[PDB]
Amino acid sequence: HSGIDFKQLNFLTKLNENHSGELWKGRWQGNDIVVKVLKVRDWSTRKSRDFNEECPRLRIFSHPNVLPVLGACQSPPAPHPTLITHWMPYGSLYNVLHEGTNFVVDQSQAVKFALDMARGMAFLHTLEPLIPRHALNSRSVMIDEDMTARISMADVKFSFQSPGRMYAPAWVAPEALQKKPEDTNRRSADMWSFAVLLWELVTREVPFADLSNMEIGMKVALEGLRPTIPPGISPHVSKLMKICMNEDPAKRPKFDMIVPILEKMQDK
Amino acid sequence: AFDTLFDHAPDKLNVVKKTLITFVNKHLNKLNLEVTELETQFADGVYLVLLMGLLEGYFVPLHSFFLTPDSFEQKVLNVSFAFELMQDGGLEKPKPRPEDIVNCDLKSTLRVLYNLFTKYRNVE
Numbered sequence A: 001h002s003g004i005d006f007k008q009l010n011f012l013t014k015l016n017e018n019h020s021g022e023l024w025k026g027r028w029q030g031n032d033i034v035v036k037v038l039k040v041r042d043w044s045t046r047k048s049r050d051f052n053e054e055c056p057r058l059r060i061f062s063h064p065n066v067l068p069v070l071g072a073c074q075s076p077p078a079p080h081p082t083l084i085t086h087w088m089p090y091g092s093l094y095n096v097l098h099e100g101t102n103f104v105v106d107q108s109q110a111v112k113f114a115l116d117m118a119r120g121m122a123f124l125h126t127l128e129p130l131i132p133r134h135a136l137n138s139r140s141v142m143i144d145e146d147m148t149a150r151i152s153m154a155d156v157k158f159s160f161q162s163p164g165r166m167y168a169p170a171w172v173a174p175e176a177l178q179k180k181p182e183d184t185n186r187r188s189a190d191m192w193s194f195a196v197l198l199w200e201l202v203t204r205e206v207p208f209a210d211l212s213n214m215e216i217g218m219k220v221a222l223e224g225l226r227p228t229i230p231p232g233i234s235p236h237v238s239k240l241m242k243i244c245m246n247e248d249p250a251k252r253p254k255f256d257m258i259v260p261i262l263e264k265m266q267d268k
Numbered sequence B: 001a002f003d004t005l006f007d008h009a010p011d012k013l014n015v016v017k018k019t020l021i022t023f024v025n026k027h028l029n030k031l032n033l034e035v036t037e038l039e040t041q042f043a044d045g046v047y048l049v050l051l052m053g054l055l056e057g058y059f060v061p062l063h064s065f066f067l068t069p070d071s072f073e074q075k076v077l078n079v080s081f082a083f084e085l086m087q088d089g090g091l092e093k094p095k096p097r098p099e100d101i102v103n104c105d106l107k108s109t110l111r112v113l114y115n116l117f118t119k120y121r122n123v124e
């Protein structure tokens, strides 16, 4: 549990820089990878220790719809707390749905994505305790070479990583916009996020795209802002979306309950 | 510098104060919130927190700050949290103490607002 040696990483090309730090495409020990480099103000020995304790939980190799963190570089001795994960050719679900200049995925593929994500989340929901600060959204699911959707463990926020700032409130349950995690049923909150993903798969639109993140969180939390259920969809898809986005967290289904429903939707 | 502007350029100062009212309402109105008085409306830290999120593209979970502060202390904490968000956005640590904002020191408040304006000029 010394982690990955940062010097062994082959940094090939920079993909992004943002509030979190940066992302590079690279190679390590014959793996095509991305390298997430976390920039953290007031880095301390406490935060470093925390990083080294939080990372192991993300190394999940036991489910096809979960994309593990391969490993992390501890800082020190690395320049920055860094983590690595397999490179996914299609990038995020968000990329594929919203930024897909080559092709548009069909509804059968959309149903398979929903099934893949549901299976992955049901698995993650078996963990005790749950992985903290794991938020489900289309940016935090990747699409592999064979169009398999996989929950991105490299998108789980660390305890020191932008605390008190949400960059994807549109997928967050209303209770989760306002209450501390400890004061919510986290599994029900995650089902709300899945309901928004369903809406996103049905509309092929970014939820609340015409609103800033601050507007979204403030209006959903305090003004009752909701996605409008799309017109001209089967009563079955309609009923699924509705129950997953129940205003009452206690009435939302578990992931393991919706899995069989989704399975029948591929091919009854 | 800004002090010279505050203390020795009243004509400019009002043009600047004018710049700032437009600059902050450009954003807070989106929340159905209006700023008419620069002297006090940022004292409790709430609008500064909401502004930083409106300006830097994130929501602040309501459990992360005091949306309706009930004490001098909670206001201080809000301003401090806002000052931390400012530094995360790349601003240097603000010159005023968080207490100076809460105590309605106009120079202090306007300095903070001015440094925001000069940074976030082009944000829509």
Ligand SMILES: Nc1ncnc2c1ncn2[C@@H]1O[C@H](COP(=O)(O)OP(=O)(O)OP(=O)(O)O)[C@@H](O)[C@H]1O
Binding pocket: A015, A016, A017, A018, A019, A020, A021, A022, A023, A034, A085, A086, A087, A088, A089, A090, A091, A092, A095, A139, A142, A154, A155, A167
């Ligand atoms: N495993 C991966 N394989 C290929 N591309 C990825 C992978 N992970 C992320 N990406 C791509 O890199 C881009 C930038 O991701 P990055 O993590 O920098 O930003 P983000 O996910 O929006 O924000 P956050 O810093 O909060 O994680 C993503 O939009 C996606 O296209």
Ligand SMILES: [Mn+2]
Binding pocket: A154, A155
């Ligand atoms: Mn990411």
